[PDB]
Amino acid sequence: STRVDWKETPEAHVFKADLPGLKKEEVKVEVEDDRVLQISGERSVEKEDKNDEWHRVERSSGKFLRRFRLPENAKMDKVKASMENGVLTVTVPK
Amino acid sequence: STRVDWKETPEAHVFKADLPGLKKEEVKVEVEDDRVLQISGERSVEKEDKNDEWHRVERSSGKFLRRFRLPENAKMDKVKASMENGVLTVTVPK
């Protein structure tokens, strides 16, 4: 499960999700009925080569999904997202 | 704990570590005696503002450290590292 921090400033709700190996265009950020913010996507996996040998396998892959019900002060039509170095930031202005 | 995959191809040992939020310059990649590869660093935390309210705190911070003993076929002096999308790739040629 995706680790997400959620902070509320006087100006905005700010979400930060750790999504290593993804960039912005691969993460779907959307608003659903009832003030719900949804983040989702799929982390892709490199194709294996016959000549590869593994010594450690610890990283996860596959689908991720988180949903947050924002409070009434949030301007859900003004959601903006950006990503850098594996961290997604979603800002919902108040 | 940092998740690290280690693959060995005919050409190299390839390590991939999920280190979201870190710049390449913040990650120390070092070779120590006895063919040990060490990866370490510290993820910084944004200065707290008294006016903020936290709704969710899930993301890790603080120091990390992993060590790997490479086999004799690794050319430890030719190590290279790069980071992209919160993934550190360390390549040790064979």
Domain boundaries, chain A: 1-94
CB-count exposure of residue A70 (10 Å: 0-12, 13-18, 19+): buried
**Strand order through the sheet with A62-69:** A28-32, A36-43, A62-69
Distance CA(A7)–CA(B57), nearest Å, equals: 8
The domain B1-94 having CATH identifier 2.60.40.790: the answer here is: yes
> Which chain A residues are Cβ-neighbours of B11 within 8 angstroms?
none
Distance CA(A27)–CA(A12), nearest Å, equals: 21
CA atoms within 13 A on the CB side of A83: 21
State the first-to-last Cα distance of chain B, in angstroms, to the nearest integer.
Answer: 28
Contact check, Cβ <8 Å, A52/B9: yes
Residue among B53, B91, B43 nearest A18 (CA): B43
Distance CA(B57)–CA(A9), nearest Å, equals: 15
| B91 interfacial to chain A (CB closer than 8 Å) | no
Contact check, Cβ <8 Å, B59/A3: yes
Joined tokens for residue B53: 């309210």
Distance CA(B66)–CA(B38), nearest Å, equals: 6
Residue among B81, B68, B13 nearest A52 (CA): B13
Cβ neighbours of A3 (radius 10 Å): 15
Way the structure was solved:
X-ray
Contact check, Cβ <8 Å, A4/B87: no
Distance CA(B26)–CA(B16), nearest Å, equals: 16
Element (H, E) at A66: strand A62-69
- The reported resolution of this PDB entry, expressed in Å, is 1.9
Joined tokens for residue A90: 């979603």
What does the angle CA A4 – CA A9 – CA A14 come to, to the nearest 5 degrees?
Answer: 30
Contact check, Cβ <8 Å, A52/B7: yes
B33-46 residues labelled b (16+ CB within 10 A) or e (exposed): eeeebebebebeee
Residue among A88, A93, A92 nearest A2 (CA): A88
Joined tokens for residue A29: 């950020």
Distance CA(A2)–CA(B52), nearest Å, equals: 23
Taking the CA of residue A79 and the nearest CA in chain B, the distance in Å comes to 18
The tokens 């992209």 sit on which residue?
A: B84
